[PDB]
Amino acid sequence: GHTGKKLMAQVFFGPTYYQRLRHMVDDKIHARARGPVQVLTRQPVEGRSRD
DNA sequence: CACTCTACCGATAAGCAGAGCTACCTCTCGAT
Prior knowledge:
With about 50 residues, the chain is largely without helices or strands.
């Protein structure tokens, strides 16, 4: 596509049935600087959903 | 001086109970 030149190799090409799986990156991405701690250990809490 | 007859510590298993069982991560759901 960049040059319009043919590819030296031919490409296996055609329809195939593909699935959209439940795993999406913006449901997983997570970062923590500081945030909440456990009352008993004062160590950071567990889980994306709790910071 | 040839006998048993019992108090020893070996060396046996011998039976047992418990101690342990990859790393990190996601989400939903129920009970207190």
